[PDB]
Structure formats: C-alpha cells, structure tokens
Design an enzyme around this catalytic site. Structure first.
Site, PDB file in Angstrom:
ATOM      1  N   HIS A 173       0.792  -1.225   0.000  1.00 19.54           N
ATOM      2  CA  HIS A 173       0.000   0.000   0.000  1.00 19.54           C
ATOM      3  C   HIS A 173       0.831   1.285   0.000  1.00 19.54           C
ATOM      4  CE1 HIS A 173      -4.016   1.447  -0.182  1.00 19.54           C
ATOM      5  NE2 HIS A 173      -3.901   2.199   0.897  1.00 19.54           N
ATOM      6  N   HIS A 208      -1.352   2.058  13.432  1.00 17.56           N
ATOM      7  CA  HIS A 208      -0.940   1.642  12.091  1.00 17.56           C
ATOM      8  C   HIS A 208      -1.349   0.208  11.774  1.00 17.56           C
ATOM      9  CE1 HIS A 208       1.034   1.268   8.339  1.00 17.56           C
ATOM     10  NE2 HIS A 208       2.153   0.715   8.767  1.00 17.56           N
ATOM     11  N   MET A 243     -12.037   2.749  15.204  1.00 14.81           N
ATOM     12  CA  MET A 243     -11.039   2.253  14.269  1.00 14.81           C
ATOM     13  C   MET A 243     -11.680   1.575  13.068  1.00 14.81           C
ATOM     14  SD  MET A 243      -8.257   3.465  15.688  1.00 14.81           S
ATOM     15  CE  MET A 243      -6.862   2.576  14.634  1.00 14.81           C
ATOM     16  N   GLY A 244     -11.015   1.705  11.921  1.00 11.41           N
ATOM     17  CA  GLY A 244     -11.415   1.032  10.690  1.00 11.41           C
ATOM     18  C   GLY A 244     -12.200   1.924   9.756  1.00 11.41           C
ATOM     19  N   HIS A 247      -9.444   7.089   5.741  1.00 10.15           N
ATOM     20  CA  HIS A 247      -8.059   6.786   5.385  1.00 10.15           C
ATOM     21  C   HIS A 247      -7.251   8.044   5.144  1.00 10.15           C
ATOM     22  CE1 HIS A 247      -5.159   3.657   4.464  1.00 10.15           C
ATOM     23  NE2 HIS A 247      -4.709   4.400   3.468  1.00 10.15           N
ATOM     24  N   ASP A 298      -9.532  -2.584   7.131  1.00 10.50           N
ATOM     25  CA  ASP A 298      -9.476  -3.246   8.431  1.00 10.50           C
ATOM     26  C   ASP A 298     -10.857  -3.520   9.029  1.00 10.50           C
ATOM     27  OD1 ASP A 298      -6.541  -3.431   8.806  1.00 10.50           O
ATOM     28  OD2 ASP A 298      -6.623  -1.238   8.888  1.00 10.50           O
ATOM     29  N   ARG A 323       2.148  -8.202   4.154  1.00 11.87           N
ATOM     30  CA  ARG A 323       2.788  -6.956   3.774  1.00 11.87           C
ATOM     31  C   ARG A 323       4.309  -7.106   3.625  1.00 11.87           C
ATOM     32  NH1 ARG A 323       0.876  -1.752   4.220  1.00 11.87           N
ATOM     33  NH2 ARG A 323      -1.021  -2.846   3.544  1.00 11.87           N
ATOM     34  N   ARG A 342      16.453  13.648   3.937  1.00  5.50           N
ATOM     35  CA  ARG A 342      17.074  13.806   5.249  1.00  5.50           C
ATOM     36  C   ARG A 342      16.101  14.522   6.178  1.00  5.50           C
ATOM     37  NH1 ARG A 342      22.922  16.496   3.753  1.00  5.50           N
ATOM     38  NH2 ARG A 342      23.674  14.851   2.333  1.00  5.50           N
TER      39      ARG A 342
END
Lengths: 362, 360
Positions: A173, A208, A243-244, A247, A298, A323, A342
């Site tokens: 992803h 995550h 949650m879920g 995005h 999810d 993944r 950086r």
C-alpha cells in the site's frame, strides 16, 4: 509531503482505485493466488503457470524453522504481544541466516514470506499449549498453510479462498508508516532483516497495524444492530475514535473494503456468530450517516478473519505475513535508487545555557 | 520534518547543545550518567539525584537467563549490531513496557544493560565463556571496558570512554533518530522504536563511519604512505569516511574533544603511530579538498587505543545514542504529530488483466 518515488503501487489520480505494478486490485483479488501477487511484487512480473508452479514449490520447501529459532520462540512468554514475537523472530532468523551481500535479496524475501506463518504459529502453540507443532506441512498454498498450522487441520476451500484474497489485499500500500520505516532503513545500506524488523516494529503500533483487532473488540460489544447504532452514537458524542474508518489518503472510498466486505458476507452464513456481519453493517451505516466516513480495509477484515476461526490477537501477525511482500519490494527499490529525504527538525528548545556545576544545582 | 527541544547545532552550523548545555562543558565536567539523566529526565541532576541514578544503573546489569540463552545462539560471525537488534527485541519480549507510564524504567534498563548484551554475546560466541555481567564498577564507561577486557581499565581509559559516550549521546534528527520517532508515532512500544533505530543505525552509511575510518587508517604504515594513498583515492573520485558534515560548516565540535583523547592515548599504546597517520590524513584532506574531520574520524583511534576490537566499534554507538533515542521517543509521544509520507508514482499505467493461461 513527497518522501520519494515508486513504481510498485498506486492509489488513483482523483483518489480512485488501487493497483500493484499496474494491475487492478479487483483483478488480483478475484483471479490470483497470494504466491502470484508476491511474485508480481517481488519479481516485477505476473508469473506464467510454470513459473508459479516452481515458485509455489520453492516456498513449500522453505517451511523449516532452524533449531536455535525454535529455541528462542519457546522462550518468548505467552503474555508477550504477538507482533513482538514477529519482531524477535525476524531479527533472530537474521542472525542465523544472514543476507550477507545484497545479491541474495530475493532469496531472503522468499524465505521470509515462506516462514513467517510458522514463526507465529510455532510460538503460539508452544507458549499457549506446551506443544511443538510440525511446520513442514504439504499444503500447496500459503493461505492454506497458515490455517493448517493455526487450527491443526486442513482448511475448507472457501476458507482458503478468503484467506488468500485477504493476503492479496494487505500485500502492499505505497508509502505508509511501516513501508517508510523499511525504506529509511535500506537507505543507510542496512541489511534486509533490519529493514523488515524496523517495519514490524512500526506496524506493532495500534494506530498503524491493529485496526481490525480493535474493530473486532468493538463489534463484539453488541448483541443487535440497534444496540450497535446506539452504542456508536454514544462513542461519537463522546468524541471517542472508532477504528477502521476513513483513510489518510483516500477521500471517498477504499477499494479493498468492497472486496473484503464481499468475503465477510460470504462467510457469515456458515459461522456460529454470523450475526456479527449485520452488526458490522449497522456500524458502517452509522459512521456514514453521522460523520460521512467510509470503512477502510481493516473494518470488514475483522469479521472475515473471525469467521475463519482466527483468534483476534493473531490478526496483526497476518498483516506481516502479507505486507512483507510489499516491504521487500520497497526495499529492493530503495537499493537501486537510493535517495531519501534527510529529516531536519525545527528547534524549539532553550538557548545556550551557562554551565551550572553540580554543587550549585538546587 | 518535526520539532524538538532536545538538541541543536548552533544557528549558523556552529557548536552543539543538549537541552541548552554545550557539548564542551558536558564532555569536560559531566559523567555519561549525568548526561543520560539530562536527556531522559529533562534537567541536570543534583549531586543526590546523580548518586541515586548512578547506583540505580549499577543494579540493572543482570541479563535474564532466556536472553543469555538467545545470545549464546547468535554465531560469532553475526554483525555485532544485529546482536543489539535481537537483544533489544528479545529483552522487550522478556521485560515489556506495558504502558507508557513505564517509559523511564525501561529507558534506564536499556542504558544500563546494553554493554552487557554486547559483551556477553561477544565473549560467549568468540571465547566460549559465560562472563559475569553484574560487576561493581561505579561508572558505565568503566563497566563496559571491564566487561570487554576482563580487568578494570586505567583512569585515562575510563575518562576517554566516558567522553566518547557523551559525544555520541544525541544529535538532532537523523536516519536512526527519525526511525525511533516514526515508530513511536504509531503508538508502538519503546522496545520496538529502539529496535528500529538499531536496525537503521546498522547501515554503514550512518553507523559505521569510525569502523570504516579504522580500516582506512590501517592501510598505512607511515605518514608518507598515508598521503600518497589518500591522494590516489581523491584523484579516483572516491570519498573518505570521517570527513565533512551535512549541517556543520567549518568544524565538528565533537571532533576536537575526541581528537584530544586520541592524542593523549597515543604514547602509551603499542601502535600509537596510528595517530600520526590519522593526523597526516586529516592534513591532506584540508589541503586538497577543504574538508574537516567529523567525530567518527578520531573516534577510530580513540576506541582502538582503548583496546576495542574494530568490529565492536558500532555497538558503542547504540550504548550512547539510546539516550538520545529515548529522549526523542518521549517527546514524540507527548506531541504525536508526524508528516504522513506520500510518494510520487513513476510506475506503469493501468494494465488490462491477463489470465495465467495467457502469459508469455
């Protein structure tokens, strides 16, 4: 917020529709085995029948856990978080079977894809039941393999198919916390196990990696759709985070949700607690109606795995098992075009202080 | 990329502070424990606070049997930095954080135990002996040298080591520190974040410059050989470890401190001629390419004169920088903001599906 460049995967231009190396996720999840998509990701092409046959066989013969790895997993306590088991397992394998030169990239990726299901399950069964399971099983598919190691018997065909599709959905992803971590790591010319370990360590974070685990806990609070509607509204008025949903990148829809939802719905009728799907649908409707949010992968992933008889605590290690293909793909790409941004920090601390000898402090 | 109150290089790339205090004043006046306390607890300790903290770390030097078991099974040929990786990760399985209110307890443990992890692995894997890690040495610098070499070191050796652990403790955002933050930004535990930093620091472009400098220095028996041999590497475009810096413009303030220690150590070392070799290399790099030496350059000879095997340079970075890492992890947890990275897509356009029967 540009951190670099990839050819591996993309979300669409107006934010629509996911692809792996140009191929739609709808086509992959419908038509491919996980091995096939791992081949696409790891090797940069869709395999022919022969190539798939050979690859599929190579992975089946990489299901041996080294004695010192078993030794180590046997010493990780039952109470340890399953993702920490993956973290250590990966790191320790890296000590025992080091990558050495980068020309071994592909072989280590193949070893990791093949063995990760065994690392989790061997630990699970030893630490929870005092049993050393046989990990050298003859299951032709990686989806079936995992379900065999976990549940102790070969899986039905519909179970294999669902697990297989789920693995495809979680394979890759773009840039995300964990894939980024893997690339930061590779950009220092670190070994492949370091990179994957870093990614696992990052995926361990509940913001995550663990959303389907939290979504299962949530769905299981409610006996009826009504109770779930009412319970979700209380959580929203109390500004709690569910949650879920939503995005960081997509804005109307997550293409993977439809696919996983389709599967959950398919598995529900032959499940003891198949009512949990309708609970989930009620939750979805209420998140849309109230705050215009759509389910991500999810959310329905929770009921899919649950209807596969996968324990909720083992949801997060399955993400690693999938993944790891994407990570390794991003690691291979960083190695060939090694530029990374950086990090520089804005200083908001104190200005140069005069030294205070210890005798004068307080 | 984010904010910090922990450290900074001075406005125009001059000097260095940890929480406002100069590296020079820290190296000259402070113990490493005192500096770890400053980074971890956000203030210079009183005498009483430092005393209790120093004593606290002395009694955090035991390795759990399971971890020993694991260290015994890592081959001697395994990169020592992969040892720190697995050791940190396994200790995490053995003594988990379990809630961020335990942050400080774990950080203190990591700082106290990392030397033992490295040295216990090393002596078992290389010599076949199980060393005692619960030594009574009062100071962390001296503890590491005692564990490593099997005897208490001379005071000058303890001082140098102590200075080096101060100099390496923290240095703003960098590959390794950033991985620690990225990891913490997902609400991962402390062991995961540290393990990620170690996995990032394992790359030689970031964590192995002083080891590379030792290999380079060592190619040369005399200063004259050093000069002709560097000159041949420069005319061949290739580039020399220990020289230049992304942020500093004129000099690396940590250089002067470590170079002084190397300079002090040379006379009594078997092979102290290596300082003059380093000194000649430094001189040629100024004269040809206007570059200054960074911390990692004379870190090479300093550690070498402390009788540290070259391969074991890199784990010392972990023993020091864990303090900076933990500092940054706490700060990230208190203001949990991070830029979500997007990529530019350079890949193929949408491909039509090809059934497997139909490929090639």
């Amino acid at each position: 917020q540009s951190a670099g460049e990839t050819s591996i995967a993309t979300v669409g231009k107006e934010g629509h529709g996911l692809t792996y190396r140009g191929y739609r996720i709808e086509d992959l999840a419908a038509n491919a085995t996980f091995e096939e998509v791992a081949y696409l990701l790891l090797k940069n092409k869709l395999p022919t029948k022969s190539e798939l046959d050979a690859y599929t066989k190579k992975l089946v013969n990489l299901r041996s856990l080294p004695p010192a790895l078993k030794d180590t997993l046997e010493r990780i306590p039952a109470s340890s978080h399953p993702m920490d088991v993956m973290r250590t397992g990966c790191s320790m394998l890296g000590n025992l079977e080091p990558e050495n030169g980068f020309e071994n990239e592909q072989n280590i990726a193949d070893r990791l894809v093949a063995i990760f299901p065994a690392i989790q399950c061997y630990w699970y069964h030893y630490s929870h039941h005092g049993k050393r399971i046989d990990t050298e099983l003859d299951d032709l598919t990686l989806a079936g393999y995992f379900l065999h190691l976990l549940l102790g018997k070969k899986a039905a065909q519909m179970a294999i198919d669902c697990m297989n599709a789920s693995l495809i959905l979680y394979a890759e992803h773009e840039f995300n916390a964990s894939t980024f971590a893997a690339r930061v790591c590779s950009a220092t010319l670190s070994d492949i196990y370091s990179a994957v370990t870093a990614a696992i360590a990052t995926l361990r974070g509940p913001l995550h990696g663990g959303a389907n685990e939290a979504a299962m806990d949530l769905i299981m609070l409610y006996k009826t759709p009504s109770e779930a509607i009412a319970g979700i509204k209380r959580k929203l008025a109390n500004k709690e985070l569910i949650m879920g949903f939503g995005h960081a990148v997509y804005r109307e829809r997550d293409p993977r949700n439809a696919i996983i939802k389709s599967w959950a719905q398919k598995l529900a009728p032959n499940a003891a607690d198949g009512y949990l799907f309708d609970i989930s649908d009620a939750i979805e409707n209420t998140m849309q109606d109230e705050k215009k949010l759509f389910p991500n992968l999810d959310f329905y992933s929770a009921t899919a795995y649950h209807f596969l008889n996968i324990p909720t605590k083992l949801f997060t290690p399955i993400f690693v098992m999938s993944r790891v293909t994407g990570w390794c793909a991003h690691i291979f790409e960083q190695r060939k075009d090694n530029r990374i941004i950086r990090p520089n920090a804005d200083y908001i601390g104190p200005e140069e202080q005069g030294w205070v000898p210890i005798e004068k402090r307080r």
